[PDB]
Design a protein around this ligand. Structure first.
Ligand SMILES: [K+]
Ligand SMILES: [Mg+2]
Ligand SMILES: [Mg+2]
Ligand SMILES: [Mg+2]
Ligand SMILES: [Mg+2]
Ligand SMILES: [Mg+2]
Ligand SMILES: [Mg+2]
Ligand SMILES: [Mg+2]
Ligand SMILES: [Mg+2]
Ligand SMILES: [Mg+2]
Ligand SMILES: [Mg+2]
Ligand SMILES: [Mg+2]
Ligand SMILES: [Mg+2]
Ligand SMILES: [Mg+2]
Ligand SMILES: [Zn+2]
Lengths: 76, 56, 47, 133
RNA sequence: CUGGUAGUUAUGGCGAGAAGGUCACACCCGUUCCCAUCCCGAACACGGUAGUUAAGCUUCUCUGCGCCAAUGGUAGUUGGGGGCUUCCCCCUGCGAGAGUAGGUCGCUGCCGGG
RNA sequence: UGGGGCGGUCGCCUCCUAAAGAGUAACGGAGGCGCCCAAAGGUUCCCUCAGAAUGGAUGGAAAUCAUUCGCAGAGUGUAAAGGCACAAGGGAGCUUGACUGCGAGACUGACAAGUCGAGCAGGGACGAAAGUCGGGCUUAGUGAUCCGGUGGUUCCGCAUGGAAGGGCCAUCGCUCAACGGAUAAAAGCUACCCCGGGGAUAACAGGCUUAUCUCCCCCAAGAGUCCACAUCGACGGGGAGGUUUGGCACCUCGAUGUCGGCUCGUCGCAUCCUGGGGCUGUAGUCGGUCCCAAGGGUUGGGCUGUUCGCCCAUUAAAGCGGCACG
RNA sequence: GUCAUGGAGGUAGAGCACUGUUUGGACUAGCGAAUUCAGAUAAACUCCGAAUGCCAUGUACUUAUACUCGGGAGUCAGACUGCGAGUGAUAAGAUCCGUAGUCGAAAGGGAAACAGCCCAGACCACCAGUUAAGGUCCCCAAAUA
């Protein structure tokens, strides 16, 4: 008797790192993802592995673009 | 204003209810507080209404 | 694939490491890269 | 009754909470067997019930089976300890929730229909009742 | 009234039926020139305007499809309490999906010409 | 490590389990990696897939051509998931940013490590500008220190000038795969065995469980010379018991003696004989089956350590189980 | 802690729009692939989608911690009960996670006795009172209500 299974990968800790309505400082990571599950908005950049980050100081807002999609912005 | 009396014990109860009873100012059983009638205090009373007696 | 070192043709400094396929590229690769010593772009050649 | 192929060979056992999602009404024939409780029903039980109720009617009328054994279950032999992976598949089962109609018949009078359904219900591990459209 | 250019979860789309005009727009005519075709002046580019609303375009009418969508009920469920525990029941608060009444053949902004 | 051994596994990536933040175990359920690409990288410009119907020589269901329908039913180097038709998919032109010094601030995290990053300077590629470019749609494709090799260097250099030798920067040498890597270097037997410990962990018996097992039933197709139910009863279904084969590891390792027999028994009843009865495929004789019933009774030898079993000869009969297999 | 407000997130349920599994007709390229009609099913299906839990904001009301630096530790065998899962047989006082409680380290009252269930936290003394779970014919305090 043997299983021939038993392997897994380490969890990567994805999801939202800041809250809607929270004040954030420049360069902070807002969201971690595979693909553009959420798009970059105003004053928000997209990293090389799809990480969304703030480019200025301000307050975070999760918003809804056209019907099927979402984005996040930072407003001073 | 309304009067609040702790009738049941806290042994065997979950932590959120103990924290709510603490924030109401109540200590040992049969102890009494008098408070105002805000929606905040009403929400507290709703969370622990099975442990407490309320009198207007 | 193999590991490659690229040498500056005006200083002899070995500034860069890269890779290539030896069957597809049997020659010596040449690329124009920045040279930190001369602070300008110079042709670099595989050693 | 066995599925031709499956995507996976092993599966969780599941649960049987709540009333049946769909199939609680007679939809093709005039008469039906309805489950009053929940139970796993294997394909041997389905086959035995079907043969009994079909033989009583002498191949007259029509019979519809409204449940399929999609799920598989496994087992371990005698003498093996716990561990070392999951066991080997044995049979196929249908989980039936309360309120599900599992057999329907048409094309025969009251007496033949009711007696055939009574004969069939004695082959099943669940508590049943007879309903008319 | 029309041409350009924006915003807004298709209530804005698809489909069907018609009217209109070289003022704008377009089809259309041609390839000397700049430029172009793995071939083709079809497209792209350039040079003009005989004919035209046939089409695009603009305007009006349709619920056929699509899309939007209540109310009540039901499933599920936080907290409290019970059974005869494959599971089930009661009290309080929250409350779908499906189905339906119904809505929809768009609505706002700036500029140049009639 | 559901005792140990045998077998399997040991690092990294993706999904489910995982209970709508993150995290989350099992010798749980499924698959990949130890690379590849000089373009399959950068930029500028351009455009759009699978399949089907119809019409046509070789040509055929499917090869090339033409029209229509066609939101992606294709593709995306490779596993999966999340993404992508303002392409991240497909073509063409020019190229080497698959740059050097860095880096406000964040994510992850015991540490060691790992991940994202606007922006600044140097010098560039492509574009008319705007601008994009510090590899590849994203996430695997890797190994510390010590010790050595190679290139560079306005560093040191044991009286002084040198040299030998070191330091610093760049790079190379691991299936160190038991993948945080004990050493540069390593396999077996012990029934001749010994010490320290453990009921943290197996072998006997106890406990829990009841798949299996023994017994009892439900439905009734059939058998029974006609005839379901005298006697049996397939395919399926439901229980009781705790004597079998198992599962678990709860008491006992500063000791709970382990098979068979002998001696001495005692209890249960699911009754082997004897007592009472109903049905019969009960004419009689001889039987079958079920209900009541535990008062008493229930053999001597051959073979085998045997329990069991087969045989010989009897008997009214030669019961089955529990009591630490009394 | 509650209240108000704003968000991220795909479980329960449901559904069939994709992917697998699947039943009965009509029609059928040729007993039988496709199209349609009706009806099912899913841990690794999703056109949908809660309750809870989580992250923030507030000037709202209440309440008492939170953090940083330094000295000294012990712990790395856990158990049962309820709820949500895996393994097992939808067995085990079994095993392995998540969530809350009690024991551990907790005496007192009730479950006959009975770590882990129900009620409830012992500073000391009293020949005082009121209650909880559980009870009120006798043992045995209280209704032969
Ligand atoms: K039945
Ligand atoms: Mg590419
Ligand atoms: Mg070594
Ligand atoms: Mg020997
Ligand atoms: Mg034994
Ligand atoms: Mg035992
Ligand atoms: Mg001892
Ligand atoms: Mg003998
Ligand atoms: Mg005799
Ligand atoms: Mg015995
Ligand atoms: Mg201890
Ligand atoms: Mg103790
Ligand atoms: Mg006690
Ligand atoms: Mg009375
Ligand atoms: Zn140089």
């Amino acid at each position: 008797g043997s299983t021939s299974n038993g392997r897994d990968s380490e969890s990567k800790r994805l999801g939202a790192k800041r809250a809607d309505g929270q004040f954030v400082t420049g360069g902070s990571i807002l969201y971690r993802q595979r693909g553009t599950k959420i798009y970059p908005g105003t004053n928000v950049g997209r990293g090389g592995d799809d990480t969304l980050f703030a480019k200025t100081d301000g307050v975070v807002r999760f918003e809804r673009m056209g019907r099927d999609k979402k984005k996040v912005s930072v407003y001073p | 204003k309304l009067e609040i009396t702790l009738k049941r014990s806290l042994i065997g109860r979950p932590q959120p209810q103990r924290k709510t009873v603490q924030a109401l100012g109540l200590g040992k059983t049969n102890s009494v507080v008098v408070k105002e009638d805000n929606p905040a205090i009403r929400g507290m009373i709703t969370k622990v209404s099975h442990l407490v007696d309320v009198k207007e | 694939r193999v590991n490659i070192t690229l040498e500056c043709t005006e200083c002899g400094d070995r500034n860069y490491i890269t890779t290539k396929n030896k069957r597809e590229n049997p020659e010596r690769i040449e690329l124009k890269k920045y040279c930190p010593r001369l602070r300008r772009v110079t042709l670099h050649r595989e050693t | 009754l066995v599925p031709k192929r499956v995507k996976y060979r092993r599966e969780f056992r599941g649960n049987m909470r709540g009333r049946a999602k769909g199939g609680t009404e007679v939809a093709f024939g005039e008469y039906g067997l309805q489950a009053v409780e929940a139970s796993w029903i294997t394909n041997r039980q389905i086959e035995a019930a079907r043969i009994a109720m079909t033989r009583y009617m002498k191949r007259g009328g029509k019979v519809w089976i409204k449940i399929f054994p999609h799920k598989s279950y496994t087992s371990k032999p005698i003498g093996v300890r716990m561990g070392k992976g999951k066991g080997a598949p044995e049979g196929w089962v249908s989980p039936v929730k309360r309120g599900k109609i599992m057999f329907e018949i048409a094309g025969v009078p009251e007496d033949v229909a009711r007696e055939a359904l009574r004969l069939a219900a004695h082959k099943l591990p669940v508590k049943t009742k007879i309903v008319k459209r």
